Design a protein around this nucleic acid. Structure first.
Lengths: 55, 19, 184, 142, 70, 141, 100, 112, 67, 141
RNA sequence: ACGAGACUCUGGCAUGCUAACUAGUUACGCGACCCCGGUCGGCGUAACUUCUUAGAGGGACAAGUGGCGUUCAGCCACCCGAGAUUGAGCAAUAACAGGUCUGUGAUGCCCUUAGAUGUCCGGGGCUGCACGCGCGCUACACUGACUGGCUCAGCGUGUGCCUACCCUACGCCGGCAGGCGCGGGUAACCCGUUGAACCCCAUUCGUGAUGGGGAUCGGGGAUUGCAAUUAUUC
């Protein structure tokens, strides 16, 4: 069947499994402290999260 | 919380919510 | 009380050259037990001059990359060198070092003021150049040889203090002064 | 008898060494082992310098336990060098007259400032665009 | 360097004769001036101290320094 | 004791291989192709041999003992994890293979991969890097 | 009876105002209080490239996020702490009361 | 969305006192003036005039994007005291960036 | 490079000009004068101003200053 | 009266290693001859009777700090894995040889597996250690 | 007036302050071992906060002294001192036909839109090699390599939303990679007193492409995964 082929290839690991929680894209991911949020998004929302440039 | 998230993760999760 | 390395009591040593007398810090005040110290001798300009010459030698030995910041390893080299100097000559190894630093420093050198005219040297320049030359002698001498660093460093300090011109330091020093006479 | 203990530290880098000057006889040791076997032996005299410059008679009435942690081998040696020195100067401040403490501070500072004053030098932070603080990655032209 | 690995009759008689009349006895010195390998020279100077002919000054992992008695 | 003994063999010929008598035994047997520093030391340990001796000194009845233990390492309790041909493809036996045999077994291993026309054997045939390198910038003869 | 309040905050002056109010809240009601233990502040760190593409000189931003933890022990009955901790909190601070 | 229980989250909707010193309030103000069909110059002076009369020490209204043709052009409207460097830029200047979709492209609005 | 900026000097001149009689030659007393008679938000700037104040007070002891 | 910490530790292990030799009841493995002491070593340990030496070393490492298990022993007997062409890294020792050494010192009543994991050193051991510390303290005069 | 500086963070100082069984020290008792004392990160409780953490303050200003200088700004040297330029972050007007449409449910226009340039699945490719260039890693050894022994860090991270995937002591099997049990930790609590490397000490080596170097290549053994051949890694 088509339902046996549509989503049957595993998405358990690798940068084809996890994605940005804004962009939905598969590159430059900040997985640290469970951000799960691409590096351009984090750089947009840093201020809003509580991340501050001091030193 | 029953899962009991880390304090590092909790304050980042609090920020992501606000964002 | 009494000093250097265990066994090379400082005062005894005469600095023959009254020109380098100030900047060869060996005697009376600079008598310390090791060639090791905290440092701060390279913070201000001439603070270098008030560093004991055995620490200067130790520092200038750890060179050609692989040795950088292996000071304890060259504290040891200079220790074993001073052993060899005393046994092979019969003098106070400090006196042999001071005599070498005096005889190994080029007294005038050429520079670009064309065909590069000759000028004089600072006494501190002579001490710096002397330490460099006889260490670069010891380092080159030992490379791909069964002879050790402490032997090569001893033999360079002897042949320099002796005034041999068989040393690397005295041959290059004569070579600098010879080029300097060639354009004065 | 009463408590004549003074607990004085010495830093020479990220190594903190705290020496403990009690009343008693002349035993000086570091984490329970005496100074004659603290490695490296290359810097044997560096620990004996306050013992040599002052003599055993200063450390006759005092016994010094030294706790050391942090830094590396040479930093820990310079830490304990500074600690037992500063700790005796602190013992001779409180538990004898300032005349003895003045006399001894003089003889130590005259030899090496670092016996009683900590070097404020610390490992400078690396910056991006290089392998360390000042050094940069190799620039390529053409 | 076409050095020797163990002693001849000649080079053993040369070592036993001449070495204890040196003001600087190192295995490097012995292993240059008698045309021998450093290991053979270190073994030789162990036996010459064992029989009690040469004075020890400082032994180290890197370099041993011996000399002669009178 | 430190003098050159009699019948001190400068040039030994063990498995038609010139062993230097001037070298120490554990580093002179290594001259034989198929035995390395780590094998030689364990071989000389199995036979009760002082390995501080030069390769010229030791006795020809004792070097025949050394050869027999190199050739048949299993029977003198050297493990199967220690040999340069473990679980062989044709006979299924764990065996150390030495110089002239090793050159034969390497030729056979390349010739086996060649005849079957496998990607590995084909890359050997073409004189290229086989263990999965990048040939763009290195291999540059 | 041994009740352990954990004050965790991003800001210091808001956390110092809250722990100062909980010392005044423990001194006025005259219950025995182990002082506010300053825990080692945790600097959460993210170092990204500034450039959304790869085509400038390799500049890096270095986003810190300091999180300060205090904790205060009280010798207080349960319902007394329920009254104290419910009064005058400011939204920067997270308060977790341990019963036992 | 966020997985809060039944009525354990309740919203309020309070009023901005002196809204001329809120940056994103005057950004969206300028955004919906331009999108409404007003001219760029008049709108920008209009915002800048309001936030000055509101009692702001200084203000900087930049409008970048495609103006009066194909080429992109940044019209900058400055007056009063405006700081850029140091820590005070955090807690003195209030910055806002907003996109606006015109039928030709995208203009960007910076109210500082 | 220990050159005082206009913010240091202007402040230090006005502080002498209006509160001359409260000042002296000691740095540490007129450091605490500058604390009271002015609202300076920095500690470093407070010291800079106190420092140049004391320098101008030594200059006034010699003779009259142009500014 | 002296303890092991007052004594030079370098010659102390050689003296304890000779004590375990003369005593001779440690139950050394069979593979001592063939085993390489870590994954970052190249060659077999040069001294044939290393097991006595590392038993001695483990003994006095347990004296100085208690509750050290097998994983702790691999940590203290670790060094550089010289990864040929790639940069060298920290590498832990052999899990087995640390486990056997501890089991040897546990067989001969010198250590005792401690509560909350790991081996401490039993008072009979602390005795034997300090008795030979006295021997070495006496020997160096 | 902006920019510079000021500012913010950070490094260095406080035997002054505020305090601590998720941090110690010192006393005391108990217990172990050696010949009263010494050792103990063996066990527990009585003061304190030096060590530890992090809060509030303080502290340094070319301030003191001598020189040089319109004797002005300032500069050099020296005392006292924890510092006599700690290091970063921030960043002006005006630009560039700099980069990014492959970061985006930022986007105009254009193309494509069921035989798709949507999308999924399978395989291959991105690694393919006469060659030329750039950032590098390892080296060329005896200031070393090998084998033992000895003894010291500081930043961090660590069990997830969808999301499976954490860091690991300790005990057994195995040479090793690794396996199997059972523990602890959502963390100053556990890994962890982070027993790191270099270094330090003692063997072997001996100027020989050598025990330097470890490329290349053969055979075997384990782990991650649905899958390793174009050798994942070990």
């Amino acid at each position: 069947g088509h339902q046996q082929l549509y989503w049957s290839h595993p998405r358990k690991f690798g940068q084809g499994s996890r994605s940005c929680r804004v962009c939905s894209n598969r590159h430059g991911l900040i997985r640290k402290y469970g951000l799960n949020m691409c590096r351009q998004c984090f750089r947009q929302y840093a201020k809003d999260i509580g991340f501050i440039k001091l030193d | 919380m029953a899962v009991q998230i880390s304090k590092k993760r909790k304050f980042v999760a609090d920020g992501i919510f606000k964002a | 009380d009494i000093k250097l390395f265990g066994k090379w009591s400082t005062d005894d040593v005469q600095i023959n050259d009254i020109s380098l007398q100030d900047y060869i810090a060996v005697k009376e005040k600079y008598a310390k037990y090791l060639p090791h110290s905290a440092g701060r001798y390279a913070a201000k300009r001439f603070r270098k001059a008030q560093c004991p010459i055995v620490e200067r030698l130790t520092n200038s030995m750890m060179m050609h990359g692989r040795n950088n910041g292996k000071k304890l390893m060259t504290v040891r080299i200079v220790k074993h060198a001073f052993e060899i100097i005393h046994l092979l000559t019969g003098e106070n190894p400090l006196q042999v070092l001071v005599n070498a630093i005096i005889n190994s420093g080029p007294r005038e050198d050429s520079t670009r003021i064309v065909r590069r005219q000759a000028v004089d040297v600072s006494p501190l320049r002579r001490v710096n150049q002397a330490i460099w030359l006889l260490c670069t002698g010891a380092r080159e001498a030992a490379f791909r040889n069964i002879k050790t660093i402490a032997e090569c460093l001893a033999d360079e300090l002897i042949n320099a203090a002796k005034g041999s011109s068989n040393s690397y330091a005295i041959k290059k020093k004569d070579e600098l002064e010879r080029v300097a006479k060639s354009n004065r | 008898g009463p408590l004549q203990s003074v607990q004085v530290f010495g830093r020479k880098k990220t190594a903190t060494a705290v020496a403990h000057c009690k009343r008693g006889n002349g035993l000086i040791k570091v984490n329970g082992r005496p100074l004659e076997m603290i490695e490296p032996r290359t810097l044997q005299y560096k620990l004996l310098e306050p013992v040599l410059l002052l003599g055993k008679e200063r450390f006759a009435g005092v016994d010094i336990r030294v706790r050391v942690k942090g830094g590396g081998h040479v930093a820990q040696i310079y830490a304990i060098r500074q600690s037992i020195s500063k700790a005796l100067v602190a013992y001779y401040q409180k538990y004898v007259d300032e005349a003895s403490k003045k006399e001894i501070k003089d003889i130590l500072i005259q030899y090496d400032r670092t016996l009683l004053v900590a070097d404020p030098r610390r490992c400078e932070s690396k910056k991006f665009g290089g392998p360390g603080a000042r050094a940069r990655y190799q620039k390529s032209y053409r | 360097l076409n050095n020797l690995v163990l002693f001849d009759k000649a080079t053993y008689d040369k070592l036993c004769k001449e070495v204890p009349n040196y003001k600087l006895i190192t295995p490097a010195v012995v292993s240059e001036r008698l045309k021998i390998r450093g290991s053979l020279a270190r073994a030789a100077l162990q036996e010459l101290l064992s029989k009690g002919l040469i004075k020890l000054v400082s032994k180290h992992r890197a370099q041993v320094i011996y000399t002669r008695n009178t | 004791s430190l003098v050159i003994p009699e019948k001190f063999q400068h040039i030994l010929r063990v498995l038609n291989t010139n062993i230097d008598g001037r070298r120490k035994i554990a580093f002179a047997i290594t001259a034989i192709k198929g035995v390395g520093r780590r094998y030689a030391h364990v071989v000389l340990r199995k036979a009760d041999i002082d390995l501080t001796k030069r390769a010229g000194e030791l006795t020809e009845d004792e070097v025949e003992r050394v050869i027999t233990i190199m050739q048949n390492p299993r029977q003198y309790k050297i493990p199967d994890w220690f040999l340069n041909r473990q679980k062989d493809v044709k006979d299924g036996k764990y065996s150390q293979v030495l110089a002239n045999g090793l050159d034969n077994k390497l030729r056979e291993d390349l010739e086996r991969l060649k005849k079957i026309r496998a990607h590995r054997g084909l890359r050997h045939f073409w004189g290229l890097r086989v263990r999965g390198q990048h040939t763009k910038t290195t291999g540059r003869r | 009876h041994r009740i352990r309040i954990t004050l965790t905050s991003r800001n210091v002056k808001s956390l110092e105002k809250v722990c100062a109010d909980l010392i005044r809240g423990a001194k006025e009601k005259n219950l025995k209080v182990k002082g506010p233990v300053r825990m080692p502040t945790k600097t959460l760190r993210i170092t990204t490239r500034k450039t959304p593409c790869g085509e400038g000189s390799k500049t890096w931003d270095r986003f810190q996020m300091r999180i300060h933890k205090r904790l205060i022990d009280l010798h207080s009955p349960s319902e007394i702490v329920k009254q104290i901790t419910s009064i005058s909190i400011e939204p920067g601070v997270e308060v977790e009361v341990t019963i036992a | 969305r966020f997985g809060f229980p039944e009525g354990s989250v309740e919203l309020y909707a309070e009023k901005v006192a002196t809204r001329g010193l809120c940056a994103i309030a005057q950004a969206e103000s300028l955004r919906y003036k331009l999108l409404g069909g007003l001219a760029v110059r008049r709108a920008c002076y209009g915002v800048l005039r309001f936030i000055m009369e509101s009692g702001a020490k200084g203000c900087e209204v930049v409008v970048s994007g495609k103006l009066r043709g194909q080429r992109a052009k940044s019209m900058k409207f400055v007056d009063g005291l405006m700081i850029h460097s140091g820590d005070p830029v955090n807690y003195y200047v209030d910055t806002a960036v907003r996109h606006v979709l015109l039928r030709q492209g995208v203009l960007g609005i910076k109210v500082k | 490079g220990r050159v005082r900026t206009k913010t240091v000097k202007k402040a230090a001149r006005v502080i002498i000009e209006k509160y001359y009689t409260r000042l002296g030659n000691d740095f540490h007393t007129n450091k605490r004068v500058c604390e009271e008679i002015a609202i300076i938000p920095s500690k470093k700037l407070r010291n800079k101003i106190a420092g140049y104040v004391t320098h101008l007070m030594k200059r006034i002891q010699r003779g009259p200053v142009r500014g | 009266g002296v303890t092991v910490k007052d004594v030079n530790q370098q010659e102390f292990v050689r003296a304890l290693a000779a004590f375990l030799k003369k005593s001779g009841k440690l139950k050394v493995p069979e593979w001592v001859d063939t085993v390489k002491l870590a994954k970052h070593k190249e060659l077999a340990p040069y001294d044939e009777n290393w097991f006595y030496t590392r038993a001695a070393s483990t003994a006095r490492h347990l004296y100085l700090r208690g509750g050290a298990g097998v994983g702790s022993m691999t940590k203290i007997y670790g060094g550089r894995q010289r990864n040929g062409v790639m940069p060298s890294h920290f590498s832990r020792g052999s899990k087995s040889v640390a486990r056997r050494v501890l089991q040897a010192l546990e067989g001969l009543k010198m250590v005792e597996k401690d509560q909350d994991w790991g081996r401490k050193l039993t008072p009979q051991g602390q005795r034997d250690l300090d008795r030979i510390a006295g021997q070495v303290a006496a020997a160096k005069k």
